[PDB]
Design a protein around this ligand. Structure first.
Ligand SMILES: *[C@@H](O)[C@H](C[C@@H]1CCNC1=O)NC(=O)[C@H](CC(C)C)NC(=O)OC[C@@H]1CCC(=O)N1Cc1ccccc1
Lengths: 300, 297
């Protein structure tokens, strides 16, 4: 069972390079607007306490170099929305997909297209952590890389990349420029709040392992929802809600394992460990597959 | 470290569907040729022990329905190369990238663009196991999905999907239609699998690059002595090509390949002794030397 990203071609056709001064990162070109992180306008010194409105009013359209492949796009206007800059260009992107901007919830997954100098480099699946970080793979120059889901022909953009934290996890914004989490686009070492494990996702994954013939971790027992949730919170697992239980129905039907029966299996794993065994290849309980993800991939 | 696929857009621009009767699978459209698994020409009854040569003689161009989306592509010629069908079409694919056809070695990784009815569903990284199988996520209708790597702007196609083995792993061919491994497109067991030594060594190099180097020792080994030990632990023997592709990581860390082999040999013989490497007690074997350099840089 495989962590699978959405096909990235519709997003690749939107990625451009944005340069201001000696800073280069990526931008997302939709119709005649390029979206990018606003910290592109900051210098070494600005970045410790950047007064962005004051820094932006001092910029001219020609201070922004936007390049799509070999071609330069002419910036004819700019504006700032929260932590994103919106560069109006004189050319429409003919590869603009059907799209929307969404703000995702913790526990939801999305695909990241990691880009450098406006060129796509890799694609992988991430989850919005309960503490609003993401465990990404982002190096210098990756800012402006985006995260997205696809439904039919519509790209739902949910993430734009801005920073890496001292622990090696990542933080960013939605496409309205609002950060996920308590982070700020200044050049400071920032810690996240305590992370927790996405319980509804671990349960989806356990069901996926059953669907794939792996059942060593099952047991004959059950648990109530509240008693499960007491043990969950003790182990820094998120509470499981009745909506989560409802969401897991399809995987429950399929396998004929009641949700609360799988909860009792997970409780045993938290208390007893895996004893060196592995599940779906992993020595660790995996929490970045949603129920939808498991079903979407057991469906086609 | 994450499994990271290559961006799939250049390959999405080449996917089509190929139907013969009611059997639809995926094909790859490059210039004026569509490549797909030859078993598209088989009914269920032929799938037992098909006579592909006979089946292909009974076929004509007008029996093949090739479609990009719902747009038919006219077939003007057909031929068989090993286990792939090549359909000449009357239109050169305007989205053809720079490409080549490569046959990869066990241990090498590649991106799979899983497709159904010519439409991409997902992309993910696979490693060719030493027993010439991959652990895919392939369902009915996935055949003809391809595996690839991208270098600069050149797509190297290395895999086309054909079948699922009893144990739930996957087998297929290169783009010249030669199966990886001893498999045939009929109605077979994968050889017992082994650990991909060259990738474990890449993973130890990765750990060193990140400052996790407790396992380095003061000794070395010959390649023969290491290979003989490794096989007792169900690890693949190293080839000269493996030594060579570890060269960049050896040079980045200053740790000779054979010195790293001696460190690995000690881990195998003594175990981890309760310690971890890059946070795990398990040694990862699905990241190549190129994967490591690509994520550390
Ligand atoms: C895109 O411009 C980059 C992307 C990051 C670079 C390395 N990996 C990334 O994901 N974004 C930035 O560099 C951020 C810019 C500010 C928001 C203005 N800054 C940033 O990511 O800082 C990262 C460094 C490295 C690790 C860390 O903890 N850190 C913060 C820091 C800052 C100052 C002193 C000490 C630590």
């Amino acid at each position: 069972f495989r962590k699978m990203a959405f096909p990235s071609g519709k997003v690749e056709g939107c990625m451009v390079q944005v340069t201001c001064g000696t800073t280069t990162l990526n931008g997302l070109w939709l119709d005649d607007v390029v979206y990018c992180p606003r910290h592109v306008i900051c210098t070494s010194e600005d970045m410790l306490n950047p007064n962005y409105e004051d820094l932006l009013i001092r910029k001219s359209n020609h201070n922004f170099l936007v390049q799509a492949g070999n071609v330069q796009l002419r910036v004819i206007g700019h504006s700032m929305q929260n932590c994103v800059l919106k560069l109006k260009v004189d050319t429409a992107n003919p590869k603009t997909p059907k799209y929307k901007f969404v703000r995702i919830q913790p526990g939801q997954t999305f695909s990241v297209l990691a880009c450098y100098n406006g060129s796509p480099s890799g694609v992988y699946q991430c989850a919005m952590r309960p503490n609003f970080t993401i465990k990404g793979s982002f190096l210098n120059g990756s800012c402006g890389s985006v995260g997205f889901n696809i439904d039919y022909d519509c790209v739902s953009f949910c993430y734009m990349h801005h920073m890496e934290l001292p622990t090696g996890v990542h933080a960013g914004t939605d496409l309205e420029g609002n950060f996920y989490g308590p982070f700020v686009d200044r050049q400071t070492a920032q810690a996240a709040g305590t992370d927790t494990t996405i319980t509804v996702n671990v349960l989806a994954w356990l069901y996926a392992a059953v669907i794939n013939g792996d059942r060593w971790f099952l047991n004959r027992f059950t648990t109530t929802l509240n008693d499960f949730n007491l043990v969950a919170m003790k182990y820094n697992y998120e509470p499981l809600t009745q909506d989560h239980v409802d969401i897991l129905g399809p995987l429950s039907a399929q396998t004929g394992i009641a949700v609360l029966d799988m909860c009792a299996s997970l409780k045993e794993l938290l208390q007893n460990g895996m004893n060196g065994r592995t599940i779906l290849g992993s020595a660790l309980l995996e929490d970045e597959f949603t129920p939808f993800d498991v079903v979407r991939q057991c469906s086609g």
